[PDB]
Design a protein around this ligand. Structure first.
Ligand SMILES: CCCCCCCC/C=C/CCCCCCCC(=O)OC[C@H](O)CO
Ligand SMILES: CCCCCCCC/C=C\CCCCCCCC(=O)OC[C@H](O)CO
Ligand SMILES: NS(=O)(=O)c1cccc2c1c([N+](=O)[O-])cc1[nH]c(=O)c(=O)[nH]c12
Ligand SMILES: CCCCCCCCCCCCCCCC(=O)O
Ligand SMILES: CCCCCCCCCCCCCCCC(=O)O
Ligand SMILES: *C(=O)CCCCCCCCCCCCCCC
Lengths: 149, 401, 84, 90, 49
């Protein structure tokens, strides 16, 4: 009764934090570009003004500059091992698989009270949470191992 | 206005077939002509030199050929081109002050960031060693099981060294971890002892060869001088045949440069190329083993063009300049000379240099997680596998009941 | 966490089958990483898998630290704050 | 003064960069205590030259004397002699 | 000799009166010319007696 509250509260907190991480664009503070190439406009001919940015998983944005707030969509595939890593970082399957496993975890906890004799539902919850953390580990490594190329 | 077709100085427009007059061309010298003309209030007409040569002396019939000949013989009144200022030309025409200082630099194939592979933690040892360790591991474990549990005069088991446990002991011995049981018998202790000695050498060798790798990759120094190339004999520096860059080394009295000239004269195969396009290709088509000696202006252009596999290194070996030229006895000499000094103070010569060599370009200590990424994937993979194993057992037993 | 799970979750082993609780599992992983000892070792296939990968991961990391530290102490490269 | 700016660079322990001409920046880099050097490339293109009175008959001969010494290599040997050979850093 | 010329820790030194000083003064070799330059203006005077 009192140990399930921490489990329920923790599961919500973890799912909430992982949905706001995946959804927001404050994963990295780099110094790149956030606007498409101004071919005709010739604002800077080709290479625009590199300014401080805040990147995420899908969109890059600009803190300072005359384009403050413009958010381009990160282009992963530019121009085997490298290609596979770029297909896993682009889709963000592991940061999104964690979300799905954190969600399934809480579903089991919800089901753990409408069926108080099926003890194998609480075990499934725990496995989903442990597995969700494992996916988070992979996602973090994949994300960091991609930004270094 | 005599001019020569060279990039990025002069280039045909994207659709110059639907254009007539001075608008058919574009480039640094086309913009420069517009800047110079308006400052001196003159009207010009761009006209490419028919021969395509810069300006040389036949040395026989003593007839100047090229842009210089197009000025001495009164065929043009202003030569807005990358025409180098030289003494031999100064005796027949009067150049203006240089609008672009340059020299002889070094071009090498731009290197790669060498993104570490995923399973690069295995690099200190060869694939054969890693494969043989697995074979040795299996053999030791089997022999540890053979000598410990075969004798029927000791059996309740005489110890806890079964096949599953023999594998566990050997695995923890290699990693220098583990507790639990150690062999109590003579033969079993002989297996343990040699396996422990084998582990001690291999683990020390891995650490010692990883340190060697990290230290020698930390001692590498990029080449940033002509002297470095002269000392080295792996990469083959090369110039051209017809032009200054070959005369410079031939007449050079500097020891650092004299040795290079000697080499190139008798080296085989002949490093002396013919066309600049051929040269710039050789360096790329050699995987960082050729070095081209060309002008610092051309080098900084190539570097900013695709496939972006070239870069500028070191510093200029000499100091030359490009100056606008005019016939002798003309009247534009002074207005043009002042026009080139006005376009420099105002920064219009650096704006045009950035505009064409950059703005209109195309090429734009600690261990990282990429260096140990693979061992992180194995760990999480092993954690997932262990979870899979534990559940399958659970499921099997649960079904039975 | 994984070591704790694979060791104590099954009810068909329990009084406790081993000492690998959450507190002890943290101690085991710490001792393994620090290259020190082994108060308890997993005796089950699933548990031993966790130990083996952790022992391999540790080995690489500890060797990498020592190897990269030696490189630092050998070659002393100076960083120029300004290059342009 | 230039000497002030140089001095402000050693006193600041590395929290001040002096923007001066390249030729002078490559003279103080070769003089003791040997704690100052040059970084980056030239931000501008300016040239030292030899001046003569307007209308003088020595204009053209001087123009060809300077140009000849550059092709020969004397102007480069002279610089390396009084900048690096007479240096004190190494 | 080239190693000494590159190095600035150890101070090479000749004599004043004799060949060994004339040799560096008249030397046209770059590896030797730099050493002569140094010794001429270096302080304290490396030239012994
Ligand atoms: C009964 C006791 C045993 C229990 C079992 C415990 C497992 C321990 C294994 C750890 C090392 C495994 C590391 C595997 C490394 C694979 C490397 C790989 O994939 O190869 C690189 C690739 O070829 C690039 O070209
Ligand atoms: C109490 C029972 C303890 C256990 C008992 C067994 C333990 C074995 C341990 C190490 C063997 C290492 C042997 C190393 C021999 C090196 C070979 C050698 O001497 O080589 C000379 C060389 O060839 C000249 O050029
Ligand atoms: N483009 S290049 O391949 O490097 C090149 C190669 C060979 C001769 C060149 C030359 C260039 N250039 O740089 O434009 C300018 C230039 N100007 C002169 O007056 C002259 O005599 N020869 C040249
Ligand atoms: C595709 C996602 C893979 C990673 C996550 C996998 C988690 C699987 C958990 C399944 C339930 C395990 C417990 C079942 C108990 C039982 O019914 O015996
Ligand atoms: C206890 C003995 C074995 C310990 C585990 C060692 C893990 C390495 C084995 C796999 C590596 C095989 C090498 C192929 C990849 C390569 O280096 O090219
Ligand atoms: C009986 O067989 C019950 C079902 C067994 C499920 C086995 C899989 C459990 C999870 C292991 C892998 C976790 C990976 C986490 C990162 C994606």
């Amino acid at each position: 009764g009192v140990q399930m509250l921490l489990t329920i509260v923790g599961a919500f907190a973890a799912f909430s934090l992982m949905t706001i991480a995946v959804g927001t664009d404050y994963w990295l503070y780099s110094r790149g570009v956030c606007k498409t190439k101004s071919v005709s406009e010739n604002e800077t001919s080709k290479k625009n003004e590199e300014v401080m940015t805040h990147s995420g998983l899908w969109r890059t944005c600009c803190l300072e500059g005359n384009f403050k707030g413009l958010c381009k969509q990160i282009d992963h595939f530019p121009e085997t091992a490298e290609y596979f890593l770029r297909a896993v970082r682009a889709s963000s399957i592991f940061p999104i698989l964690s979300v799905i496993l954190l969600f399934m975890g809480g579903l089991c906890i919800a089901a753990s009270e409408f069926y108080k004799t099926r003890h194998n539902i609480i075990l499934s919850a725990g496995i989903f949470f442990v597995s969700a953390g494992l996916s988070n580990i992979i996602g973090i490594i994949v994300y960091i191992s991609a930004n270094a190329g | 206005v005599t001019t020569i077709m060279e990039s990025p100085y002069v280039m045909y427009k994207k659709n110059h077939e639907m254009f007539e007059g001075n608008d058919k061309y574009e480039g640094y010298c086309v913009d420069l002509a517009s800047e110079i003309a308006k400052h001196i209030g003159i009207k010009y007409k761009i006209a490419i030199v028919p021969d395509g040569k810069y300006g040389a002396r036949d040395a026989d019939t003593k007839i100047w050929n090229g842009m210089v000949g197009e000025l001495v013989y009164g065929k043009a009144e202003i030569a807005i081109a990358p025409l180098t200022i030289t003494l031999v030309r100064e005796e027949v025409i009067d150049f203006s002050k240089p609008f672009m200082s340059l020299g002889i630099s070094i071009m090498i194939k731009k290197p790669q960031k060498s993104k570490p592979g995923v399973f690069s933690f295995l690099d200190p040892l060869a694939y054969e060693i890693w494969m043989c360790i697995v074979f040795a591991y299996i053999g030791v474990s089997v022999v540890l099981f053979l000598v410990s549990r075969f004798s029927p005069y000791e059996w309740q088991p005489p110890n806890e060294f079964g096949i599953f446990n023999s594998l566990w002991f050997s695995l923890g011995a290699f990693m220098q971890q583990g507790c639990d049981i150690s062999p109590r018998s003579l033969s079993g202790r002989i297996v343990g002892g040699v396996w422990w000695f084998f582990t001690l050498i291999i683990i020390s060798s891995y650490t010692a060869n990883l340190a060697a790798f990290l230290t020698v990759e930390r001692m590498v120094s990029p080449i940033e001088s002509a002297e470095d190339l002269a000392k080295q004999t792996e990469i083959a520096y090369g110039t051209l045949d017809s032009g200054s860059t070959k005369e410079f080394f031939r007449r050079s009295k500097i020891a650092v440069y004299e040795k290079m000239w000697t080499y190139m004269r008798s080296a085989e195969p002949s490093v002396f190329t013919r066309t600049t396009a051929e040269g710039v290709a050789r360096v790329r088509k050699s995987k960082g083993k050729f070095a081209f000696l060309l002008e610092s202006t051309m080098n900084e252009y190539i570097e900013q063009r695709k496939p972006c596999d070239t870069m500028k290194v070191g510093g200029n070996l000499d100091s030359k300049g490009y100056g606008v030229a005019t016939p002798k006895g003309s009247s534009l000499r002074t207005p043009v000379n002042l026009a080139v000094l006005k376009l420099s103070e105002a920064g219009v010569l650096d704006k045009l240099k950035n505009k064409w060599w950059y703005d209109k370009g195309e090429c734009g200590s600690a261990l990282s997680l990429s260096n140990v990424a693979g061992v992180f994937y194995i760990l999480v993979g092993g954690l997932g596998l262990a979870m899979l194993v534990a559940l399958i057992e659970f499921c099997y037993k649960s079904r039975a009941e």
